[PDB]
Design a protein around this nucleic acid. Structure first.
Ligand SMILES: Cn1cc(NC(=O)c2cc(NC(=O)CNC(=N)N)cn2C)cc1C(=O)NCCC(=N)N
Ligand SMILES: Cn1cc(NC(=O)c2cc(NC(=O)CNC(=N)N)cn2C)cc1C(=O)NCCC(=N)N
Lengths: 255, 255
DNA sequence: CTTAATTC
DNA sequence: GAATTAAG
DNA sequence: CTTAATTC
DNA sequence: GAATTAAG
């Protein structure tokens, strides 16, 4: 039972993650940047009610906190399908434009897979849940991502902001990838015979045999949980000779 | 008096031209071409009355003649300005597409003028009137350019066609330029010290002195008239140190 | 909603 | 230019 | 008028 | 795609 053996490693049973070994991130602004405060376009009650549960959960989790900031960006009413299903989506484009660029270090899937040797055909694929949220944001950089929030009655003071790396921020993917690489460096050293591919929050572990993959997967899950990351048990593909990774179906050494 | 000295050379007094030394032109068709007969779109009476005088003049001049041809292209109602002023314009595009291409030998004005030496600053500019019409078309090629014509009453039988190189034909400019070059070859040989630039029907004669330009112009006018070409006396610029040629103003060796 | 490149 | 698409 | 590339 | 331009 992979589930009961690693309670801390799975998002379903280990609680929200927090990368304890990573220092809170400081987000450098471009040399000429000054705060921008964009007005929140009026949100319908339907949208507000749909978003409310998520905001409260994030507040309870400490991922969102009240604040007064010179920065402010819009929250928009999203619902891809059309019937119900709401989720808060922040338009951080004006913030992104004022943040210093960093080199794009995440490899494209095609090149990443070129590092998969035919000798290793036993795989385990894991995707980390709420990955960006596991990385803390330094208090100095938190004001940057503020947005407005309120309830027709006893609504929050005014603004709320993120204490963790947020969705919609241009550097989140790269910063997360680099952080996890730092945290998994030792694991790679302790398991020289295993192949570990990282694409932001999507991991592929490859071994030469089922046994090696089993032992390697136990070690990786143990390490991820200890570091504060959380993998999706529901979507995990453990020790299979056929797996779906980054849109590809890895089979018979193909793809 | 340049006018009375060369009666035959000027269009105003020498009658319609005819290049007597040039064999009637045969127009080769592409290897897969077959005749195309395009219907004449109904012409308003206003247009017909405006065009009629020109058709009659051309018929009287023998430039247009009755015919029965498998080829037929449209005549359109033209009048650039808007009030009156009509002229027959034939849409020969479907004929052009079926005629074999020839190398474009007419130089562009820019390069043509590069052959004008600073040593020759006395000029004479002449433009030949109804130049294309001076070149006969071989009877075998005449049917190619047929079009319909008629009068609400005793109108012409049906079709009319050209016995001379027509306007709107893709190769007329090049064929005329080459023909005149053949006819003026001897003149160039007899006058080595003169510079003669030809751009289809626009000629520029350049000499080192007023006297040389005067003598050269007399010889050129005499030669052109004898060959059957006709220059516009109204637009002629004779022995001037400043002239307008091909859109350029030639002055102080400039342009 | 807003900012914007794609198509037509 | 206006409609269609994309994405924060 | 018809055929067509340019712009918007 | 529709209006604007060009040219036989
Ligand atoms: C890939 N892509 C195709 C499109 N749009 C289309 O393909 C497209 C545009 C149209 N437009 C019309 O039909 C216009 N009709 C009309 N004016 N009568 C029809 N289609 C199928 C937009 C984008 C796109 O990426 N847009 C977002 C660019 C960005 N802001 N980064
Ligand atoms: C050089 N040139 C410019 C144009 N047209 C334009 O410049 C032009 C096109 C438009 N179009 C519009 O305004 C369209 N408006 C709209 N659909 N609401 C405005 N202008 C100024 C056409 C040609 C041209 O050469 N056409 C003939 C090509 C040929 N058939 N050989």
């Amino acid at each position: 039972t992979w589930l009961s053996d690693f309670p801390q490693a799975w998002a379903e049973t280990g609680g929200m993650g927090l990368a304890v070994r990573q220092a809170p991130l400081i987000i450098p602004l471009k040399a000429t940047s000054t705060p921008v405060s964009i007005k929140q376009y009026p949100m319908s009650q339907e949208a507000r009610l749909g978003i409310k549960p998520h905001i409260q959960r994030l507040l309870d989790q400490g991922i969102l906190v009240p604040c007064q900031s010179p920065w402010n960006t819009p929250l928009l009413p999203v619902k891809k399908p059309g019937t119900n299903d709401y989720r808060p989506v922040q338009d951080l484009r004006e913030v992104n434009k004022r943040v210093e660029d960093i080199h794009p270090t995440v490899p494209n899937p095609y090149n990443l897979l070129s590092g998969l040797p035919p000798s290793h055909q036993w795989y385990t694929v894991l995707d980390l849940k709420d990955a960006f949220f596991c990385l803390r944001l330094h208090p100095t950089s938190q004001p940057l991502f503020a947005f407005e929030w309120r309830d027709p009655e006893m609504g929050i003071s005014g603004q709320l902001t993120w204490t963790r790396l947020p969705q919609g921020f241009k550097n989140s993917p790269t910063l997360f990838d680099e952080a996890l690489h730092r945290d998994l460096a030792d694991f790679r050293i302790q398991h020289p015979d295993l192949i570990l591919l990282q694409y932001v929050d999507d991991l592929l572990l490859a071994a030469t045999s089922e046994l090696d993959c089993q032992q390697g997967t136990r070690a990786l899950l143990q390490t991820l949980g200890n570091l504060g990351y959380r993998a999706s048990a529901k979507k995990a593909q453990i020790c299979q000779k056929q797996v779906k990774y980054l849109g590809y179906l890895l089979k018979e050494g193909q793809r």
